Every structure is written in C-alpha cells, then in structure tokens.
Symmetry: C4
Subunit: 115 residues, 4 copies
Amino acid sequence: MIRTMLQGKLHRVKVTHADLHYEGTCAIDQDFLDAAGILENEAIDIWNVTNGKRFSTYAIAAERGSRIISVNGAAAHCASVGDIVIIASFVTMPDEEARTWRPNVAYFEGDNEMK
Amino acid sequence: RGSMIRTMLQGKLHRVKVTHADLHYEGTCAIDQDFLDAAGILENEAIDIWNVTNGKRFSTYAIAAERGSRIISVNGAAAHCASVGDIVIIASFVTMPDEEARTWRPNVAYFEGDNEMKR
Amino acid sequence: MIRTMLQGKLHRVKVTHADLHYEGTCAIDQDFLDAAGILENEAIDIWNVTNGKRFSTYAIAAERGSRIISVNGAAAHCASVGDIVIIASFVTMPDEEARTWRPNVAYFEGDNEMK
Amino acid sequence: RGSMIRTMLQGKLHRVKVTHADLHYEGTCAIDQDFLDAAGILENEAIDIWNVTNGKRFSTYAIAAERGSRIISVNGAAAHCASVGDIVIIASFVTMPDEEARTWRPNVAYFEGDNEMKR
Ligand code: NA
Ligand code: NA
C-alpha cells in the first residue's frame, strides 16, 4: 500500500506580502524551499497559526536570501502580512519505505531567520 | 521502485470569470474545451477552484463545454461557492517521481476580459 | 504523469439519517455504491447542495434496497436529514488511460429512487 | 500496469479525546505510539482529524508520543480546530489497486473513557 507522508515543513514563518489583485502566485525564498525539500510548483499546505485557516496551493521560488513568504491571488483572503504560518508538502511512497521516512523540517524565528 | 512521488501543479487557468452558476437544475462544472486544452486539464479530472473574488477554495471536477463557448460553469453544490462574475483560478495537480518533478513545467493559461486567453 | 479522475458520483441523493452521538460511520445503500463503483471504506467527497458544505469521509454499505444515505459521527455537523448531497470518489491512473476514462454516474429523484 | 488506484481508509482511532492543545509553544500533533500501532498509522503520515464535538475537519500529520502516555496532542495552527476534551476521529488513508481495495480491511481502534482502547 502507498502512504502519504510529510515531505517537509517550514515551521513558523511570517507572511511578508499578501496581494490579492496584482500578484497571484505564492512565493517562498528559494533557500527555505531548499531546506524543506519543497519544490517550485509543488502542492503545499499552509496552516495559519494566527487565524487558524488551512488551505492548499503551490509555490514558486522568491529570490534567495529575500526571506519572502508571499501569499497572493485568492490565497490573500487566507493570510495577512505578519501572520505566522506553517507550510508543508507531502509525498507518497510504499509502506516499507514510509516506515523509516524522515521529513525535512526547518525552524524559524524573528523575521524568517532560519535556525 | 519505491520512488518518492510528488504532487505537482499540472496546469491552471489563471483569472477566468465564472459565466454560469446553477445550484438546482444543473450539477456538473463545465469549461470550454479550448481552455482545458491550454491548461492540459482533462474532462473528468479533479480540479481545485480558488475564488479570487470571495476567497472560497474547493475541489470538484469538470466536463468539457463546447469549444469556443468560453464557458466557466460552476454548478451543483459548488454554486454556493462561486457566482457569475467571480474571478477564479482553476488548477489541476498530477503526481510524478521527484526527478521529473524537479524539471516539470506546468501548463498555465492567462485570461482577461471576456475569458480571452492572452498570448 | 498520474491523473486524479472522477471514479463515480451519486447525483442528488437525500440524507436519510444524521446521528452525531450514537453512530459514527457514513452508510450508503449497497445498490448505490455498486452503481457508482464506490467501495466500502473508500474515500468519498460529499458536496451538500442544500447548505454548500463540502467534506471528505468514507462510507460503509447500508442494506441493499434500503435507499439509506446516513451521515454520522463528526459529519453530522455537515448534513441534516433531507439535505440533498452529491457523493463522489476519485481514482488515480496514468495520463494515457485518463484521457479515455469514463466515470460511473448514478442519478436520483424523489426518495433516493435511482433513474 | 496502469491499474486504477483507489484511496482507502487505512485505519482510524475512533473517538479519542484530545489531551493537549497548544497553539503558540508547540507545533506538531502527537499520538501515543500504542494508538498509532493499533490503527496502523505511521509517524509522519498524513492524517485527517474529524472533530465530533465541534464539527471541524482538518488534515495534518502526527508524530509518536511516548508509549502508554495516552496523549492526543493537537498543536500548532491545529489548536484552532480542537481543544482539550474534544472527541475526535483520527484517520489515515492509503492508496492501492482496485482489486486489493475490494477486500481491504481497515485497522480500526475504538476508544472510551481515559483514551482506553476497547477490546
Ligand atoms: Na473583471
Ligand atoms: Na467524554
């Protein structure tokens, strides 16, 4: 059987931009994507610690070192600048592999400073 | 064998406008076949609809509307989630192994006006 | 690439029972499951035409011919007796097969009379 | 090859009670490893939580809490969706080909009282 497993997680990043009108696509500092194993164009779940909203989208890379978490398009209805969110992706694999799988978790403090 | 499988954006229709929404007398969401083609979306494929106007997010499937009709019809229970005039994003996601995912290019079609696909 | 496709749909069935406390598991007349290709223990989506709620659960079989649609446990917060719902399941398959895939759709009127 | 793949209930914890819920200082949901074993749920597996008390439904993942702790800890953003004392159902779903799905038996564990697993 095939299991759905946490691939990686950005833990407690702060939303830095949220534009309904002008922008549409969610964007995340490429360094953060790299640490969590999350890919450009991959499905992600965003869990908003500030307001409790939970939604699914995909992200593209923001510039390395920018520390950007940009939640745009329709998703701007779900997060505001300054909200603390958790961003996760999930992968599937057979049960035998899933039993030893290790996700990639990156922790943040302050203004999206990775620990 | 046993490769880790990613869920990736296959394609999307960016900022199409809902043209029809009927709760009672229709059920199935329908999208102009030309639009489905541009986004690589199939008839009967699962789609996510993200409503830019009201923020609602939901999952359904679509059938093809007549080519050239420019229809985006959100019917059945989903008519509680969108209305005629609303701007929505319609996406489909596929699964593939990690290596393919890392160079995958989604099929994105951009819209304006009367559901005119931009060049 | 692997596509997620509609497997089958029960179109406009009426909820006949909704018990939060006593029962937990959603149940559907086995004849209806058979017509839609939906399996016992399969993930299903329920889209409530009456109140707009959309949720995911799984169902077990109710007695053949009972015409039961029972929405119980936590899901009783999402539907009431008399609500009209659409129940769907989805399967995955490769793109090449998905292009010709045909879902199983069953239509209903009145008191869960299949057409 | 090309078999149609079903999403099936793998297992569930039926009517466990939330024992801890911390928004700010913790993130990860945790479940007594004995409970994970009984339901066939893995550490880091996607789970659905259906809150019997308040009707909220959400998806997350769990890590193992100490065996015998009887912990059901719903933390991070998910602490907006459950509270200590709430009765919840925790399910995981797996995928498999249609033939296997048709005879698949989910791993269901039933609870009462102080998160006591019924025989
Ligand atoms: Na407009
Ligand atoms: Na109790």
